[PDB]
Amino acid sequence: GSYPCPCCGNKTIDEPGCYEICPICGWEDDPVQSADPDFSGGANSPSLNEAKRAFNEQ
């Protein structure tokens, strides 16, 4: 529980890049999608940048 979620930035991740699902924003911590934030269609349907944009409105 002490790494930032790559989407919402809150400290919810235990092992980074190991597909944990953030309980705040729902982002699955996929390392392909954090290494390429415009890549949609990995563990998450949206890209990381799409998910951050949506979450920051929420």
**18 marked as binding residue:** no
Give CA separation, 41 vs 1, 2, 7, 28, 46, in Å: 26, 26, 15, 12, 6
- The answer to the question of residue 32 lying near other proteins (CB under 8 A) is yes
- Residue 28 binding other proteins, by CB under 8 A: yes
Q: To the nearest whole angstrom, how small is the minimum distance from the Cβ of residue 41 to Fe ion?
A: 19
Compute the distance between CA of residue 33 and CA of residue 6 in angstroms, rounded to an integer: 9
Binding residue numbers: 5, 8, 22, 25
Footprint of other proteins on this chain (CB under 8 A)?
14-15, 18-21, 23, 26, 28, 31-32, 36, 39-43, 45
